[PDB]
C-alpha cells in the first residue's frame, strides 16, 4: 500500500525531472530567438535606405530625361 | 492518513499532466519565432547596402551638379 | 517509512510548483520575440532594397557615361 503509493510518486518525480531538463533546453532556445525590438530597428534602417533609394531613383530619372533633350 | 496522501498525489498527477501539455504548447510557440542567426544574416546584407547607398548618393549629387538646369 | 513517503511527496509538491512558475515565465518571455512570418517580410524588404540598388547602380553608370 505504502510501497504502491511511493511507486506512483516516484513515477511522477521521474516525469518532473524529465520536464525540468526539457524546460532548461527550451529556455536556451528562447535566448537564441530574435527580439521584436531588434527586428523593428533593422526594419527601420531598411525603410530609411528604401526611402533614400526612392528619391535617388526619381533624381536619376529626372536627369536622364534632361540629358536626353540635349 | 494514507487516503489524504493519495488525494495529494491525485492532485499532483493532474498537475504533472497539465505541465506536460503546457511544455508541448511552449515548444510549438517557440518554433514560430525567428532565430537571431536569421536576423544577423539580414543585418550583414544591410551593412553591404548601407555603403552602396552612400556611394550612390555621392555619385548622383555629382551628376545633378554637372547637369545643372535646362 | 511514513516520513520518507511524506518527504517524497514534499519533493514532488515543490518541484511541480517551481516548474509551473518557470514555464509561465518562459511563456511571457516568448511574447517579446519576433515571429518567423515577420522576419520573412523583412527578408523580402531587404530583397527589394538590394534589387533596387543594383538596378540604380546600373542606371547611374549609364547616365554618368552620357553626361561625361
Numbering used by the authors:
A (entry chain B), B (entry chain C): 0 to 69
C (entry chain A): 0 to 67
Copy out sentences from the published article reporting this entry, exactly as the authors wrote them.
α-Helical coiled coils are ubiquitous protein domains, found in a wide range of structural and functional contexts. The structure of coiled coils is understood at a level unrivaled by any other fold. They consist of at least two α-helices, wound into superhelical bundles and held together by a mostly hydrophobic core. The seven positions in a heptad are labeled a – g, where positions a and d are oriented towards the core of the bundle and are thus mostly hydrophobic. We find that they indeed break the α-helices to form short β-strands, which associate into a triangular supersecondary structure we name the β-layer. β-Layers are found, also repetitively, in natural coiled coils, where they form regular fibers with alternating α- and β-structure, a protein fold that has not been described so far.
To tackle these questions experimentally, we designed a set of constructs that had either 6 or 9 residues inserted between two consecutive GCN4 N16V adaptors, based on two different sequence motifs. One motif is IENKADKAD from Actinobacillus OMP100. From Actinobacillus OMP100 we derived the constructs A9 with the full IENKADKAD motif and A6 with the shortened motif IENKAD, as well as the ‘control’ construct A7 with the 7-residue motif IENKKAD. In A9 and in one of the T9 structures, T99, the β-layers are formed as in Actinobacillus OMP100. The first three and last three residues of the insert are in heptad register with the flanking GCN4 adaptors and therefore constitute positions a, b, c and e, f, g. The middle three residues, KAD in A9, KDD in T99, form the β-layer in place of position d.
